Design a protein around this ligand. Structure first.
Ligand SMILES: O=P(O)(O)OC[C@H]1O[C@H](OP(=O)(O)OP(=O)(O)O)[C@H](O)[C@@H]1O
Ligand SMILES: O=P(O)(O)OC[C@H]1O[C@H](OP(=O)(O)OP(=O)(O)O)[C@H](O)[C@@H]1O
Ligand SMILES: Oc1ncnc2cn[nH]c12
Ligand SMILES: Oc1ncnc2cn[nH]c12
Ligand SMILES: [Mg+2]
Ligand SMILES: [Mg+2]
Ligand SMILES: [Mg+2]
Lengths: 194, 192
């Protein structure tokens, strides 16, 4: 990747970590007696960024016999830039009611946590049986609001990361690895954009 | 897989076919001069079924250095027996305009092709540079309206298949493989 400063996690590392977290999730939910049709774990995938993680996580969960029902919502905040707008837009909400169901919000990364804070609050008031969160990446110090995810695959330093669903101006979401974008590359783009 | 009548494709066979299709798409787009930011291949992923296929496909395309821009759309129905033409309600459309862009609609299964034909024609009227479709599975004999997909991963007979994004009553999308749901199970649950 000529545009990368470095590779944080390779595809293999990501796959391995996701498998461990799926195992934890399975153990933790065993007492809930999850069942297809009548009692699945509702996964609320936060588009666009969570699409890849979601695709890989649900298959990992299936390996541990955890029945799931997928819901995709769309939330926007960074747009084409490199920093939070501070405003969270709900472009698409869930199809069905989560009231009375076990729900797990799946996100690719938590930084300022304005997005998850918005989400968690919204769904919390809908009275699900339980509500948890699993984030692929956590920038633990970038917080603007306090938020503690129930499951974190990896903690990362403050640098703009791309790949595996994460984008910079809706570019690079398709990479198999998670890499750090060189500032020279985004600075040249930013200049061209604004 | 107690609920399954038989295994159609394993994760490994699926994985291989997708790479083969991605190689072809990549060659066909070579003349299009695709570039990130300005001229990426826009993939219009039709939720919810194509979520898994899309994640593996964009990675295979990345393997071939094809720059992509991911778009996800969500469609719904107006009601029962309201349209002939496969008209659907757009709940979520593309974030950015497709006019002047090379677009590829990603779907996981085409059978009657009613809604896919409607969607194809809709984006066609928005003037993209080019418009194509890639479908994971094609039930060639089920057409209710003439429709041909530009790339297809596999042709299959008329059997209800589940797994790899495909569901029966929002169940089984998470399977790594594509299997045939026991007809009895489908019949009972459908009537239920
Ligand atoms: O914790 P926060 O600072 O809120 O940042 C994290 C959120 O920001 C990103 O989404 P973005 O707004 O870029 O949308 P996208 O998923 O479509 O890329 C990322 O995918 C998370 O959803
Ligand atoms: O041509 P037919 O056999 O009548 O069915 C056509 C559509 O039905 C399914 O989508 P669905 O409504 O199931 O959406 P989904 O992707 O969210 O499951 C299937 O995935 C096709 O796209
Ligand atoms: O490093 C990063 N990459 C992609 N999206 C975001 C949001 N916050 N921080 C990000
Ligand atoms: O076999 C099949 N499996 C899942 N969804 C659909 C739609 N049409 N045909 C299907
Ligand atoms: Mg996001
Ligand atoms: Mg983003
Ligand atoms: Mg379906």
């Amino acid at each position: 990747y000529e545009f990368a400063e470095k590779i944080l996690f390779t595809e293999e590392e990501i796959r391995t970590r996701i498998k461990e977290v799926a195992k934890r999730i399975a153990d933790d939910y065993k007492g809930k007696g999850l069942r297809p049709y009548v009692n699945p774990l509702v996964l609320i995938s936060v588009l666009k960024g969570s699409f890849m993680f979601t695709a890989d996580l649900c298959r990992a969960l299936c390996d541990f016999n955890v029945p799931v029902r997928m819901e995709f919502i769309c939330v926007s905040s960074y747009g084409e830039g490199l920093t939070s707008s501070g405003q969270v837009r709900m472009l698409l909400d869930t199809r069905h009611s989560i009231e009375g169901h076990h729900v797990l919000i799946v996100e690719d990364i938590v930084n300022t946590a304005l997005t998850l804070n918005y989400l968690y609050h919204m769904y919390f008031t809908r009275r699900p049986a339980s509500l948890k969160t699993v984030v692929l990446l956590d920038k633990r110090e970038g917080r603007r609001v306090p938020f503690s995810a129930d499951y974190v695959v990896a903690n990362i330093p403050n640098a703009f990361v791309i790949g595996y669903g994460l984008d910079y101006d809706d570019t690079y979401r398709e990479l198999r690895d998670i890499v750090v974008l060189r500032p020279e590359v985004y600075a040249e783009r930013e200049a061209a954009r604004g």
